[PDB]
Amino acid sequence: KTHVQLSLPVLQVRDVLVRGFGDSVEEVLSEARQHLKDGTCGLVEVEKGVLPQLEQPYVFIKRSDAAPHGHVMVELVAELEGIQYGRSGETLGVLVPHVGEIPVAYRKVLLRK
């Protein structure tokens, strides 16, 4: 399938134990997709002071369209030193590994895969 329905655990930035997916744009997009597929991917909502507490390169989910079955359609954009790899809509948040942190909420997304 070109798209996959996912429910992403929303984590508080200060709870996150593994604060990024790796060391290159290509690695973080690779690892983010692997974690999304394996159900081991969390989402941190981007507010003032969040991104400086996470590791670059960042992986964003961004709105790709204006929402089947409650799932917002999203795609992955990476960012490293202020340059984005990909072009998409509004940030729904920043993806991080999930290693058992307790979420505050779930974000239903339809991931272009």
UniProtKB/Swiss-Prot annotation:
<feature type="region of interest" description="Disordered">
    <location>
        <begin position="1"/>
        <end position="113"/>
    </location>
</feature>
<feature type="domain" description="CoV Nsp1 globular">
    <location>
        <begin position="2"/>
        <end position="113"/>
    </location>
</feature>
<comment type="function">
    <text>Inhibits host translation by associating with the open head conformation of the 40S subunit. The C-terminus binds to and obstructs ribosomal mRNA entry tunnel. Thereby inhibits antiviral response triggered by innate immunity or interferons. The nsp1-40S ribosome complex further induces an endonucleolytic cleavage near the 5'UTR of host mRNAs, targeting them for degradation. This inhibits the integrated stress response (ISR) in the infected cell by preventing EIF2S1/eIF2-alpha phosphorylation upstream of stress granule formation and depletes host G3BP1.</text>
</comment>
<protein>
    <recommendedName>
        <fullName>Host translation inhibitor nsp1</fullName>
    </recommendedName>
</protein>
